């Protein structure tokens, strides 16, 4: 249940985002593959409109939790795969402490054999010379644990978690995330007991790529039950 079966091998992934942060318009395309059996994601994103007006790490959480590795004993709490292939809607508000906020709306679903994440991102109230529009964030990412809770009312899940981005001066730029997911289908889905997803993310660059981009490798495992 139910995308369960859809995820037993390596699945191609496509990500497309249209963004507007303080009027700075930009688009990003990402490609790669996920192997949920190992909770592994490998992806390369390209800013297709010239330079990315925000730091790449600020976009990682926005750029497919159905690739998390759910231990066999926890399969019944895997809301993400259960919503497939029809997919789910994912919305967030990300408040950057002492700075602006991003509001995103994405749909994650299969297109044939490819798992697609299409997102619209809107950012407002950013400080022109703050850590974001001013690009003062280091190109790295910290590991973390986010707590997935069922949202029985909408038959989806909700998550509230903090991401800390390292600032070049040694300090931290907090990004408080509030997320809610609901199934696209009318299809049944599995509602989970509370548990965590533990993620680790490594960012890198493609020595041969001249466009603004980001190479991302992640491993994610569910636990807490």
Curated annotation (Swiss-Prot):
Q: What is the effect of changing residue 199 to H/W/F?
A: Results in significantly red-shifted excitation and emission maxima
Looking up InterPro entries in the UniProt record yields: GFP, GFP-related, Green_fluorescent_prot
Biological process, per Gene Ontology: bioluminescence; generation of precursor metabolites and energy
Could you say what the effect of mutating residue 167 to V is? In EBFP1.2; shifts the excitation and emission spectra to shorter wavelengths and increases quantum yields compared to BFP
Consequence recorded when altering residue 163 to T: In P11; increases fluorescence at 475 nm excitation and at warmer temperatures such as 37 degrees Celsius. In Esmerald; leads to brighter fluorescence. In VisGreen; leads to brighter fluorescence
UniProt effect for mutating residue 172 to A: In mut2.1; shifts fluorescence lifetime from 3.03 to 2.50 ns
The entry's note on the tissues where this protein occurs is: Photocytes.
| UniProt biotechnology annotation | Green fluorescent protein has been engineered to produce a vast number of variously colored mutants, fusion proteins, and biosensors. Further generation of mutants led to more stable proteins (at 37 degrees Celsius for example) with brighter fluorescence and longer fluorescence lifetimes.
* Modification(s) after translation: Contains a chromophore consisting of modified amino acid residues. Maturation of the chromophore requires nothing other than molecular oxygen.
Pfam families in alphabetical order: GFP
Q: What is the effect of changing residue 202 to K?
A: Abolishes the tendency to dimerize and leads to monomeric fluorescent proteins
Impact of altering residue 145 to K?
A: Increases fluorescence at warmer temperatures such as 37 degrees Celsius. In Esmerald; leads to brighter fluorescence. In VisGreen; leads to brighter fluorescence
The family note in this entry says: Belongs to the GFP family.
- What this protein is called in its record is Green fluorescent protein
Source organism of the structure: Aequorea victoria
